[PDB]
From a paper:
Fedratinib, which is known to be a potent inhibitor of hSLC19A3, also showed high-affinity binding to the transporter in the thermal shift assays (Kd, app = 1.0 ± 0.2 μM) and strongly suppressed the thiamine transport activity of hSLC19A3. To elucidate how these compounds, bind to hSLC19A3, we determined cryo-EM structures of the transporter in complex with three known transport inhibitors: fedratinib, amprolium and hydroxychloroquine. Cryo-EM structures were solved using either [name] or Nb3.3 as structural fiducials, both of which stabilise the transporter in the inward-open state. All of the analysed inhibitors bind orthosterically in the substrate binding site of the transporter. (1) Intercalation of aromatic rings in the aromatic clamp: Our cryo-EM data show that the aromatic rings of all three structurally resolved inhibitors form direct π-π stacking interactions with Tyr113 and to a lesser extent with Phe56 and Trp59. (2) Electrostatic compatibility with the polar contact points presented by the side chains of Glu32, Glu110 and Asn297: Fedratinib, amprolium and hydroxychloroquine provide hydrogen bond donors and acceptors that pair spatially well with the polar residues of the substrate binding site. All three inhibitors are within hydrogen bonding distance to Glu110. Glu32, in contrast, is in clear hydrogen bond distance with one of the secondary amines of fedratinib (2.8 Å). (3) Insertion of a lipophilic moiety in the hydrophobic pocket formed by Thr93, Trp94, Leu97, Met106 and Val109: The structurally resolved inhibitors all engage in this type of interaction and protrude an apolar substituent into the hydrophobic pocket, namely, a methyl group (fedratinib), a propyl group (amprolium) and a chlorine (hydroxychloroquine). For fedratinib and trimethoprim, it is known that they are xenobiotic substrates of the transporter, and consequently inhibit thiamine uptake by acting as competing substrates.
Residue numbers in the entry:
A (entry chain A): 11 to 201, 271 to 459
B (entry chain B): 2 to 123
Amino acid sequence: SWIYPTVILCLFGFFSMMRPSEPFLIPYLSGPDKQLTSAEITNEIFPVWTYSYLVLLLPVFVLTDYVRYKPVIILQGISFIITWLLLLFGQGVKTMQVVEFFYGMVTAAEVAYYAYIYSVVSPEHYQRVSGYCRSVTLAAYTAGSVLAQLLVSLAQMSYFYLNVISLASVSVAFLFSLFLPMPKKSMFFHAECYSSKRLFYWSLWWAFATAGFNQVLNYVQILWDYKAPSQDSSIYNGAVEAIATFGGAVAAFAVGYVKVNWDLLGELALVVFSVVNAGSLFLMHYTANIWACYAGYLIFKSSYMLLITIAVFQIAVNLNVERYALVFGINTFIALVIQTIMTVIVVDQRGLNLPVSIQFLVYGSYFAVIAGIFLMRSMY
Amino acid sequence: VQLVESGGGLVQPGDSLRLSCAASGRTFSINAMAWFRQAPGKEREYVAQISWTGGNTYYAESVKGRFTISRDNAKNTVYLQMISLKPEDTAVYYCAADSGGIRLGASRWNYWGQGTQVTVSS
Ligand SMILES: Cc1cnc(Nc2ccc(OCCN3CCCC3)cc2)nc1Nc1cccc(S(=O)(=O)NC(C)(C)C)c1
């Protein structure tokens, strides 16, 4: 009774998340196919993702529950096809900004993928089935990244013929999405807690830490292309993106394996590993070597996933399943307001229009000021 | 837009050359212009790029440091000043405008110029 909706939803999650072209994006955008200057990608186009995701977050969250979760999963599958049709044939800077907007829909509509299962499976088969659907997303993007490198290296496949595989993959994803059973109840429509000392405190580090994480991962392929232009030397983006994704998975798994009370060791473990994020972000900035810049990416992604797991674990210790949605929905919206303010001032063309060379001296220092504030907050 | 070039010719080594590009006809929607190069028995080669609304420039590594691309919106012309020429530069230099809008196409550059001849030799 639970195996059909999960098999169809896991197949959609696997095929929609398998996109070999993702690691080779800036190499593709700033190439002979859609030759676009680095300053045009970082300061004009990319900011449009956080602006559009911010606006299309509350409406889609309320829409996902009003109409059932299935209608919005089909919408995400369409936005996948539109994004990769423009990413293949669309030309110019203004078309790439539309691609940024449509990817904000793709990222804003994934709420219905994980929220769908709760309304179609029994409560007991929820944590197990929620794990199956989350792990198939990691296996798909870690296998897809490995496929990208194994072709670009041992087969000399053009970046253009990696978006064709990405388009073919998400086109199949929007074939199972039409076959999922339609839910017969939502969480809120058809179905004060922040006062706790822990929940508000733990939500602030989550909201602030994740906002910087999204900012760092945003302009990271631009940094790699700056330290080693893709048209001059070999670039191992696919192998690096796969190992970093795999490394982050083990960091999250290890957090739940060791049984250590996250109250006498909960705040300290978030300052020690937040310092590691800052230390790993200055290395990516101050090093002329591309291998040391790859290693800094591994440590940043692995280290961050080791705390978002601890922050999430502590947040969700007394809340119901119904209160996860509207507590993790606010935190994801606060993190976007933080990200938008940082993007407007730092990266946006109308703001400071800082290049990617100096940007990581800001992101690295951003994580160093969160550690001090959460270490200087212990005042006596 | 109808891009017509000027300023080509034969110049010894060490002499300069300024090339113009008078865009006209639908000049209202231009957001980037570039210069390309096609040496004899070769393919088109990127040489430079200038943004219209702003002024941000972008040069090919080989030609950087002696090529300078500037806009003159007032008259809608685009220039390319080339210094310290050597006999390995001789080519046909083309304009390329990326006019604007949401478009599907194979090249970022919609319209192209006729070409201007640079014959560096002695
Ligand atoms: C097809 C496409 C269109 N526009 C973009 N612009 C964009 C570039 C980086 C972005 O990362 C911001 C932070 N992210 C961290 C994880 C969630 C968001 C978000 C959007 N990327 C695209 N593909 C893409 C390429 C490399 C990495 C990423 S991603 O890390 O942000 N998302 C996954 C690949 C992990 C699904 C996405």
